[PDB]
Design an enzyme around this catalytic site. Structure first.
Site, PDB file in Angstrom:
ATOM      1  N   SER A   1      -7.923  -4.137   1.310  1.00 18.67           N
ATOM      2  CA  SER A   1      -7.223  -4.464   0.074  1.00 18.67           C
ATOM      3  C   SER A   1      -6.512  -5.813   0.112  1.00 18.67           C
ATOM      4  O   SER A   1      -6.082  -6.287  -0.944  1.00 18.67           O
ATOM      5  CB  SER A   1      -6.218  -3.363  -0.265  1.00 18.67           C
ATOM      6  OG  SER A   1      -6.882  -2.181  -0.684  1.00 18.67           O
TER       7      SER A   1
ATOM      8  N   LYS B   1      -7.744  -8.462  -2.201  1.00 19.91           N
ATOM      9  CA  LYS B   1      -7.308  -8.564  -3.588  1.00 19.91           C
ATOM     10  C   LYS B   1      -6.642  -9.901  -3.880  1.00 19.91           C
ATOM     11  O   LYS B   1      -6.586 -10.309  -5.045  1.00 19.91           O
ATOM     12  CB  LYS B   1      -6.356  -7.417  -3.931  1.00 19.91           C
ATOM     13  CG  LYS B   1      -7.028  -6.053  -4.017  1.00 19.91           C
ATOM     14  CD  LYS B   1      -6.162  -5.053  -4.769  1.00 19.91           C
ATOM     15  CE  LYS B   1      -6.896  -3.740  -4.992  1.00 19.91           C
ATOM     16  NZ  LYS B   1      -7.057  -2.964  -3.731  1.00 19.91           N
TER      17      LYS B   1
ATOM     18  N   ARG C   1       3.439  -0.134   8.598  1.00 21.25           N
ATOM     19  CA  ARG C   1       3.022  -1.519   8.403  1.00 21.25           C
ATOM     20  C   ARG C   1       4.199  -2.394   7.995  1.00 21.25           C
ATOM     21  O   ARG C   1       4.375  -3.501   8.519  1.00 21.25           O
ATOM     22  CB  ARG C   1       1.913  -1.594   7.354  1.00 21.25           C
ATOM     23  CG  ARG C   1       0.651  -0.829   7.715  1.00 21.25           C
ATOM     24  CD  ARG C   1      -0.306  -0.770   6.533  1.00 21.25           C
ATOM     25  NE  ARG C   1       0.269  -0.061   5.394  1.00 21.25           N
ATOM     26  CZ  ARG C   1      -0.328   0.063   4.212  1.00 21.25           C
ATOM     27  NH1 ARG C   1      -1.524  -0.474   4.012  1.00 21.25           N
ATOM     28  NH2 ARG C   1       0.269   0.725   3.231  1.00 21.25           N
TER      29      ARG C   1
HETATM   30  C1  LIG Z   1      -7.187  -1.251   0.076  1.00 24.42           C
HETATM   31  O1  LIG Z   1      -6.862  -1.464   1.200  1.00 24.42           O
HETATM   32  C2  LIG Z   1      -7.304   0.172  -0.423  1.00 24.42           C
HETATM   33  N1  LIG Z   1      -7.751   1.100   0.590  1.00 24.42           N
HETATM   34  C3  LIG Z   1      -8.786   1.904   0.472  1.00 24.42           C
HETATM   35  O2  LIG Z   1      -9.442   1.965  -0.519  1.00 24.42           O
HETATM   36  C4  LIG Z   1      -9.160   2.780   1.613  1.00 24.42           C
HETATM   37  N2  LIG Z   1     -10.051   2.484   2.464  1.00 24.42           N
HETATM   38  O3  LIG Z   1     -10.691   1.269   2.299  1.00 24.42           O
HETATM   39  C5  LIG Z   1     -11.489   1.000   3.420  1.00 24.42           C
HETATM   40  C6  LIG Z   1      -8.545   4.083   1.786  1.00 24.42           C
HETATM   41  C7  LIG Z   1      -7.580   4.594   0.943  1.00 24.42           C
HETATM   42  S1  LIG Z   1      -7.174   6.089   1.509  1.00 24.42           S
HETATM   43  C8  LIG Z   1      -8.263   6.070   2.796  1.00 24.42           C
HETATM   44  N3  LIG Z   1      -8.280   7.157   3.588  1.00 24.42           N
HETATM   45  N4  LIG Z   1      -8.914   4.908   2.798  1.00 24.42           N
HETATM   46  C9  LIG Z   1      -5.962   0.650  -0.977  1.00 24.42           C
HETATM   47  N5  LIG Z   1      -4.978   0.291   0.006  1.00 24.42           N
HETATM   48  C10 LIG Z   1      -3.877   0.885   0.183  1.00 24.42           C
HETATM   49  C11 LIG Z   1      -2.830   0.250   1.023  1.00 24.42           C
HETATM   50  O4  LIG Z   1      -1.677   0.624   0.950  1.00 24.42           O
HETATM   51  O5  LIG Z   1      -3.161  -0.596   1.790  1.00 24.42           O
HETATM   52  C12 LIG Z   1      -3.636   2.190  -0.351  1.00 24.42           C
HETATM   53  C13 LIG Z   1      -2.914   3.043   0.320  1.00 24.42           C
HETATM   54  C14 LIG Z   1      -4.292   2.583  -1.631  1.00 24.42           C
HETATM   55  S2  LIG Z   1      -6.023   2.439  -1.231  1.00 24.42           S
HETATM   56 CL   LIG Z   2      -9.733  -3.902  -3.021  1.00 22.70          CL
END
Ligand SMILES: *C(=O)[C@@H](NC(=O)/C(=N\OC)c1csc(N)n1)[C@@H]1N=C(C(=O)O)C(=C)CS1
Ligand SMILES: [Cl-]
Ligand SMILES: [Cl-]
Length: 247
Positions: free
Chosen positions: A52, A55, A232
């Site tokens: 993420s 983004k 984190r």
């Molecule tokens: C971005 O990092 C996004 N994460 C995901 O979509 C997940 N995996 O991506 C490889 C994911 C969400 S829950 C899980 N078991 N895997 C969003 N990132 C966050 C963050 O805080 O970094 C979230 C918690 C919402 S999902």
């Molecule tokens: Cl993303």
């Protein structure tokens, strides 16, 4: 010509990972002094999936290409109910960043396309600049890799409006990155959670704005379960408090 004093390793920060039964890296960069610090120079240069944290460059490209007109444009929920509840609503750029709404940004990448996404990441000098995989998921399970030190290099260009996109796009993204602000500091950052490919890690990249200086930070840590996602920020703030960057 660029001159760069090497990354100074401060292994005393490992105590912050050890107290929480965790393993990871914290990378700090003093902008005024042009000095870098880390607890693990090896892991600081190790490249992972951005997840993420992608983004940040994805927002910049979508804004510069007109896919997103401004931070007020509403992206309607497609009707698909997903596992994270905050994703099942309408969002703008501000809320899509805050709640890390992946499907909003997957639609961004599809509109951007493979050709423009590849050319933009090369202009950004972002990671290994490899968009191999699905155009709407490469940062989640494709070939793109970026290290904690490469994240700081990208963020320093963003802070100074030096990326090869419009200044307006960079100002809007930096506004959307706003995470915490008080009378002592401002934090503009983005979290990340990579789970589709081993190893499962969590990210936190950004910078701390002070009256007199800017401290850039980039951290990642092993995350076998979502229970320690809050570590984190907690570990990063413990390092910042130890270094007297924040009270
Ligand atoms: C971005 O990092 C996004 N994460 C995901 O979509 C997940 N995996 O991506 C490889 C994911 C969400 S829950 C899980 N078991 N895997 C969003 N990132 C966050 C963050 O805080 O970094 C979230 C918690 C919402 S999902
Ligand atoms: Cl993303
Ligand atoms: Cl702001």
């Amino acid at each position: 010509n660029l001159y760069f004093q090497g990354w100074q390793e401060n292994k005393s920060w490992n105590a912050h990972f050890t107290e929480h039964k965790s393993q990871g890296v914290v990378v700090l960069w003093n902008e005024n002094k042009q000095q870098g610090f880390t607890n693990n120079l090896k892991r600081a240069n190790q490249a992972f999936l951005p997840a993420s944290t992608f983004k940040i460059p994805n927002s910049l490209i979508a804004l510069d290409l007109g896919v997103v007109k401004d931070e007020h444009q509403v992206f309607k929920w497609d009707g698909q109910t997903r596992d994270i509840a905050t994703w099942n609503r309408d969002h703008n750029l501000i809320t899509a960043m805050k709640y890390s709404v992946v499907p909003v940004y997957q639609e961004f990448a599809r509109q951007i396309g493979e050709a423009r996404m590849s050319k933009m990441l090369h202009a950004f000098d972002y990671g290994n600049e490899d968009i191999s995989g699905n155009v709407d998921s490469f940062w989640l399970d494709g070939g793109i890799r970026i290290s904690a030190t490469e994240q700081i290099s990208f963020l320093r260009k963003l802070y100074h409006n030096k990326l090869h996109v419009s200044e307006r796009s960079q100002r809007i993204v930096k506004q959307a990155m706003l995470t915490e602000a008080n009378g002592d500091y401002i934090i503009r950052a983005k979290t990340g959670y990579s789970t589709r490919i081993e190893p499962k890690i969590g990210w936190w990249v950004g910078w701390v704005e002070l009256d007199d200086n800017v401290w850039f930070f980039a951290m990642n840590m092993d995350m076998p379960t979502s229970d320690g996602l809050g570590l984190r920020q907690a570990i990063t703030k413990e390092v910042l408090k130890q270094e007297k960057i924040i009270p």
